[PDB]
């Protein structure tokens, strides 16, 4: 097959925690982007720097697929120019982003009775991430004047915190799986095309 391995992207069994967002390089392949854009399963399919309709008529040097889980009400932060815990401390898109943000409700897989607390987000950081930066550090965050000595305590917080995905949560508090496609043009041959 010449088909790009979007099967693996969209059908992966494990999705990353957003602070540790996964990147898959896509190269040397074809895809029918309209199979994705025409899907009734993607409640978000928002492109930047390119129209979704044009994708099958474009080629790129490489494509990258970033993926992770966040709350439905945080999907709005996965866009250029946004602020909030996710855009500021977990996954940041640049102003000049060329790509598409894709999301779907994953409550059936990612919530459990009694709550699924497996997925993490970074709640505290001394500064905002730069675009496409990834911070997987676990230093105790010093929120006051007293040093933390590597230990949780007053004003001394573990910087990663659990989402609490309960099946009966209001919809925006349910888990959504996100795939961000970024389309890379270099001064080099194209390797990823439409059909």
């Amino acid at each position: 097959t010449n088909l790009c391995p979007f099967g693996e992207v969209f059908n992966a069994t494990r999705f990353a925690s957003v602070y540790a967002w996964n990147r898959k390089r896509i190269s040397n392949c074809v895809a029918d982007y309209s199979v994705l854009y025409n899907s009734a399963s993607f409640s978000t399919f928002k492109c930047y720097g390119v129209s979704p309709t044009k994708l099958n008529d474009l080629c790129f040097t490489n494509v990258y697929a970033d993926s992770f889980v966040i709350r439905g009400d945080e999907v709005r932060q996965i866009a250029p120019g946004q602020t909030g815990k996710i855009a500021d401390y977990n996954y940041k898109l640049p102003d000049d982003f060329t790509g598409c943000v894709i999301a779907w409700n994953s409550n059936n897989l990612d919530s459990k009775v009694g709550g699924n607390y497996n997925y993490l987000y970074r709640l505290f950081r001394k500064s905002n991430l730069k675009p496409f930066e990834r911070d997987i550090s676990t230093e105790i965050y010093q929120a006051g004047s007293t040093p933390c000595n590597g230990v949780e305590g007053f004003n001394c917080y573990f910087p990663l915190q659990s989402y609490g995905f309960q099946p009966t949560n209001g919809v925006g508090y349910q888990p959504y799986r996100v795939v961000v496609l970024s389309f890379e043009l270099l001064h080099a041959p194209a390797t990823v095309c439409g059909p």
Partner: peptide, 13 residues
Amino acid sequence: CPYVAGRXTCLXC
């Protein structure tokens, strides 16, 4: 729960 309430990744519990 993966941690006791207030500890670890359960600070907000």
